[PDB]
Structures are given as C-alpha cells and as structure tokens.
Structure 1
Amino acid sequence: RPTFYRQELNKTIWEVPERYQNLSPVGSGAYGSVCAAFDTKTGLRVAVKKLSRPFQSIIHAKRTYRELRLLKHMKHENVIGLLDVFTPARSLEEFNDVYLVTHLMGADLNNIVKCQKLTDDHVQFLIYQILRGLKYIHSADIIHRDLKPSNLAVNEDCELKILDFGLYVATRWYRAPEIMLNWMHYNQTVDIWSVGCIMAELLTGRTLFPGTDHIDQLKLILRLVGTPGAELLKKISSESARNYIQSLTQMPKMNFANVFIGANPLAVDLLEKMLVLDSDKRITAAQALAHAYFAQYHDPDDEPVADPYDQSFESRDLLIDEWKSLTYDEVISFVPPP
C-alpha cells in the first residue's frame, strides 16, 4: 500500500517503494546487499539493504529479527538510525522479504585511513564520537563485538556513525584477546579493545595487529602488551588456555610512547588504558569519555545512555515461523522516526 516497483539489478530482484529512486548497487552480500538510492519523500540520499533469504533457516530468521529489534530501538547521533523497514508482502502469509533503509554516509573509516593518516584533532573527534555511541549502546547491555574501520561511517558533514555488516580487512585484527579463542568470559570492554586498535591505525596509518590467524593474532598482541601477569592468570579458569599461555616465552610490555613516537602523549596514554589484556581493568567507554584526550569535545551533560533493551528473546528457541511472525509484527508496528 504504497507505489512499489521491481528492478532486477544485482542479479536479485528488488521490490521497493517509488519514494526510493535511483537504485545503485553498493555491493557485497552473505547476509544481503545494499544499494545507494534517493528518497523522493524526504529528498535525502539513502542506503537500502535487502536481506538474503531472511527466513530460510532458524538462524536466518533469528538474525533478521535480532537486527530489526535492535535498529528500531537505536536512537543516538553516533549510531546508525533506522529510517524505514518495508516488505512487498501485504500479509504475513506472503512475508518472505525484508528491507532496511538508512541514511547514506559520506564514507567509511576504512577508506579514510587508506587515503592516509588523519590529523590528531581529527582523530579526537572520531574516537570521541565512537566512544559516545558505545556509552549509549553499552548502557543497554548491547555489545557490538564487530568493531572495525568498515563499520564506522561519516555523516554528510563529519558526524560519525556506528553500524554493522558495513559494505580484505579481517575483523579478527580488532577482536579483543578474551574472545579470540573462546578464551573466557567477556564483557563490553571487548569493544574498547577494538577502539584502541582503530585509534592506533588512525594515528599511524597501519594496522596495529594484522594477525593471519587466531594463533598469530594473539602472538602479535602479547608482543605489544606483553604476556599475561600472574595476577591475570589467577582469573583464567581453563586449564588448557593456562598451559598454552604459560608455555609461551614471556614477553614484556612495550612502552606505548615508544611504539607511538611523535603521537600526542594524551592520545598515547588513552591507548595504554584501552589496550589492556585484563578485561577487568580496561577503560570503559564512559570513563574514556572523561579522559583528557577529549577535553575539547567532552560534555558529560550531552553523552546520554540508552533506555533498557530487552534481549530475553536471545534465550528463546522458536520455529522459523515464530521468528518470522515476530519479525512481521516488528515491520508493521514501525513508526518512521523524524
């Protein structure tokens, strides 16, 4: 019950509202494809993502639902906002496709560095905006766990936006050590570790830890931060992980000031606070927002938290049709922000 319209671009069929004009394949897939388009109704450039077989399996179905639920709840200036969700289906019975619309960004952070290494005052603005989005997200028990340059995009102007599944840079390069081999219990500081990795690259132009595998990755990490202290080992519950770790040639911690020569010493001190092996002593997004490095931008009366998000459904074990149905209600009940 708008004006829809087919378009076999890509190699897949796209049935979208007439308001969405100028469909341009942005690329990729596995979980679906995105196109750059123009919103006739708001006169704005947008990205339209059509999911690949949203309800093909129980994992597809839960994936779909999990994303809708999240986006619909996302209201922050540093987090990708859901502009519109739509389906060519008029009934739940013929519900087989789902599309998600967002603003079109200027570019990712991936390329921003590929072009080169940015200014310090430019890095502060970026890292601050990322951390601001993480306070929000983290406040509602949401962990990104997938932080990497391509999942960071910049506003029409210069507003940073966190997204996911952004369209060969390994996400493992930014993964915190504790979740890099089942290692053990992990919290949201897993995201902070990633941040420190992204910040370093932006400062240096090079990938901080470009491991070729999980084994090599950890090796690259323990080389910089050094092998686990006997205090950290006290908190490792797995006997195998313990043996493995202890059986490594003990590496000492490097002085970041040495690794990052010429870098803002405030920028360096933060990095020392983020790239900590013990998830328990890692700086949180909120604490880092108060760090001197961002005194220029910090504004504790403008760094908001999120309102409670219920993720009970994650626990649930339903059927394809129950996730599908639930996804339907979610599409229907959608209220366009402005």
Structure 2
Amino acid sequence: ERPTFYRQELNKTIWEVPERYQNLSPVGSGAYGSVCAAFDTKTGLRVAVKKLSRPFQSIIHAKRTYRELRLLKHMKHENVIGLLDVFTPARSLEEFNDVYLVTHLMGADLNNIVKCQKLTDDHVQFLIYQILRGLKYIHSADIIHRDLKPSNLAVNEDCELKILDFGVATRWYRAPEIMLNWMHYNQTVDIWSVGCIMAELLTGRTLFPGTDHIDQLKLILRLVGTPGAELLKKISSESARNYIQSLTQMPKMNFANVFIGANPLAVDLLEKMLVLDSDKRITAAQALAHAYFAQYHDPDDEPVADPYDQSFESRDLLIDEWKSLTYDEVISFVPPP
C-alpha cells in the first residue's frame, strides 16, 4: 500500500520521494525549504515538490509546519493554491522527520503577464474576476491574506489564475491601516490590494510606488484624500488623531480624471475598492456582482469554503505534539479528484 520511494541528492540534501514523481529539477530554495519541479506520472501533471526545511527544529518551526499543512489541506478552489499530495518517507510517527508538499507547477506570476504594459480591459476583467473569486472563498473561511501582490498571483498559459501564499516592493500593495500597524484588520485589506493591482494592470504603472514607508502613505493620501469626519470618529489613537488633525486637508481625487480612457465601470469599481475607510470598501462577494464583471459573473459557481478551525493558533504545545498533529494530517490526506 505504501508507495515505493527513491533517493536522490538534489539541493545538497538527499530527497526521498515516491517513484511517481520523476525528473526532479531544483527551482528554488530559501529558509522555508527547497522546491523541485517534477513530472507526476500518475496524473500526467507538471508539479512543484517542496521539501520543508527543519520542519520540527523548534516549537515555532513545528507550529508553522502544522499551520502550513492545515491551510493547504483546507484550500479547495480553482483560484487558490491547493495540495495535490503530501508525503513522508517515514513509516511511523517515531521516524517522522521530513515533510514534502506537492502542488501544480506554476510557470509565471502576474508580473510576467503584464511586464509594465497595459492589459486590455477584457483581460483585466478576467484576471480581477478570478482574484475576487478566490478571495470570496478565502474570506468565507475567515482568513485574511494580508500580502496580496502580483508575485503572489500565479497565471498559466490559459490565463487561469491562482492566489498563492508565497512568491517590486511588497509595500506598494498594502492597505494604509497595515502600513500604520492598526492591528484589527478588515478582510477588505485584501480588497485594497486588489484595487492597487487592478489600477496597475489598466495603466501599466504602479499606483502607489512609495520609496519608503512614509512615502507610501503620502502617495496614498494624495489619491484618496485625508481622513473625513466620519473616519476620524473611529480613530482611538491619540497620536494618530493629532497628527491627522495637523495635516492640511486634501480632497479625494476624481478617479475618472485619474484613470483616463478607462472603462467607466472599471473606474467605478476602483472607487469602491480604494476607499480610505476600510468599513466602506466593497467586499469580494459584492465586487463579483458589480457590472464590470457581467461577462464572467455566475452566482451558481462562486463557491465558499467549509468552516476553517483555527483554534490551534491560540495553543502553546510541545514540539512532539505539533509533530504528532502534523503526522495525523499527513496520514489523513485524500488527494483531489
């Protein structure tokens, strides 16, 4: 019943993988671990195989390993990275030391598809629609991505897009409240990021290319105005209020005069995404119903996720406990259809 494994030296460690995975070729390495491209002879798919580095070295490593495996096992959606396989050469918990994760091999990310050129409006609709479709799903599991950017968006040769948890400055796509360490984030932090991405795809230019942390905020407030009276009512920070109070007011710009020549429906959606007040930003579900996506929207096929039990985040367990829980998750894995 156990697959036959083989051993091969790869990124200067011995990999031990099921024989179904052929022709491993290193493609990436870092603190996280190392990744090889491979061909899965069982499915006929090109896949990425990641060997976790030091997955049980410490309590923190072990809880991170568990977290990553739980998250990948949960995500089952066309526009979100999912798990094709997870395996260990270990024949028991006693010998369990290594964790390998398998997903679709992804060629390129959103940066590659755009490469500083305007996309057509039809192409923007399709790409943003997919991102929002995956976000509706992620957000329905009560998960916030928090670091949505082009490098975290994989796109194949059929223009099919998947949201990733890994890969320019990251800061360019971050919501202002995250830049200010606000610490009670709305899921619409991700909608901010989507707005930044959409604007760049339409114009071929980064919307808010800040040079440093404060510059990023400066460029943001120039577009969306300084905080209104309704927003200021909601700021508990004495230091923030007093600073904002001191600021010479700027109105919000008219996006129609900013995104010259764009589809007016695109402009309208951007206005709804890039609102300073996070409580007033459009949600992923609401955005999917916006007229901009008329050619793609289908309420019958914009699914939500099963509830995701994140109670483990609150727990302080020992290495061997996190390891045992991770082993349970490896053993219980059922590959997708």
Q: Give the alignment's TM-score, normalised by structure 2.
A: 0.95
Whole-angstrom distance in 1 between the partners of 2:118 and 2:109? 14
Answer with 326-335 or 113-122: which moved more. 113-122
Give the 3-state SS of the residue equivalent to 1:50 in structure 2: strand
| Higher alpha-carbon deviation: 172-181 or 327-336 | 172-181
Cα separation, 1, equivalents of 2:199 and 2:27 = 28
Greater Cα shift, 201-210 or 118-127:
201-210
CA offset digits 1:197-240 (Å, max 9, x no partner): 11111111222112233222111211111111121011011112
Question: Is the Cα contact below 8 Å between 2:116 and 2:205 reproduced in 1?
Answer: no
Distance 1:3 1:245, change over 3 A: farther
Whether the 8 Å CA contact 1:108–1:149 is kept in 2: the answer is yes
Give the deviation of 1:78 after TM superposition: 1.0
Residue 121 of structure 1 and its aligned partner are, at CA, apart by 0.3
Note closer, same or farther for the CA distance 1:208–1:30 as it changes in structure 2 (3 Å cut): farther
Please say if 1:252 is aligned against 2:251. Answer: yes
State the distance in 1 between where 2:300 and 2:230 align: 37
CA distance in 1, matches of 2:28, 2:212: 26
Distance 2:163 2:14 in 1: 28
- Deviations along 1:234-267, whole A, 9 cap, x unmatched? 1011112222333333232111122211111111
User: Do the aligned partners of residues 170 and 52 (structure 1) sit closer, same or farther apart at CA in structure 2, a change above 3 Å counting?
Assistant: farther
Between stretches 143-152 and 89-98, larger displacement belongs to 89-98
Determine if contact 1:105/1:156 at 8 Å carries over to the other structure. Answer: no
Quick one: distance in 2 between partners of 1:259 and 1:171? 23
Counterparts of 1:198 and 1:47 in 2: how far apart (Å)?
A: 26
Normalized against structure 1, the TM-score is what?
A: 0.95
Mind listing any 5+ residue stretches in structure 2 that lack a counterpart? none
The whole-number CA distance in structure 1 between the counterparts of 2:53 and 2:117 is 34
Q: CA deviation at 1:308?
A: 1.0
Distance 1:314 1:229, change over 3 A: same
- Match of 2:279, SS state, is coil
Shift of 1:143: 1.0
The 1:7/1:323 distance shift into structure 2, 3 A limit, reads same
CA contact (8 A) 1:183 1:241 kept: no
Paired with 1:185 and 1:122, the residues of 2 have a C-alpha distance of 34
| 1:109–1:2 Cα change, 3 Å | same
> 1:62 maps to which residue?
63
Answer whether contact 1:181 1:214 (CA < 8 A) is retained. no
Q: What is the match of residue 10 of structure 2?
A: 9
Deviation at residue 116 of structure 1 after TM alignment: 2.6
1:169-203 Cα offsets, whole Å, 9 max, x none, are: 22221111112221242111111011001111111
Number of aligned pairs? 336
The CA distance in 2 between the partners of 1:179 and 1:226, in whole Å, is 18
Secondary structure at 1:244's aligned position in 2? helix
Deviation at 1:85, TM superposition (A): 0.5
Structure 1 residues 248 and 51 mapped into 2: Cα distance closer, same or farther (>3 Å)?
farther
Does the 8 Å contact 2:145/2:190 carry over to 1?
A: yes
1:129–1:212 CA distance, 2 compared to 1 (3 A):
same
Task: State the alpha-carbon separation in 2 of the partners of residues 5 and 192 from structure 1.
Answer: 45
| Equivalent-residue separation in structure 1 for 2:174 and 2:13 (angstroms) | 33
Q: CA deviation at 1:137?
A: 1.2
Deviation at 1:108, TM superposition (A): 1.0
8 Å Cα contact 1:270-1:291 kept in structure 2:
yes
CA change 1:213–1:15 in 2 (3 A) is farther
Maintained 8 Å contact 1:140/1:309: yes
Tell me, in whole angstroms, the C-alpha distance in 1 between the residues paired with 2:29 and 2:276.
34
Aligned identity (percent) is 100
Counterpart residue number, 1:293: 292
Alignment deviations for residues 60-103 of structure 1 (CA, whole Å, 9 cap, x no partner):
22221111111111111111121000112222222222111111
Describe the SS at the equivalent of 1:236: coil
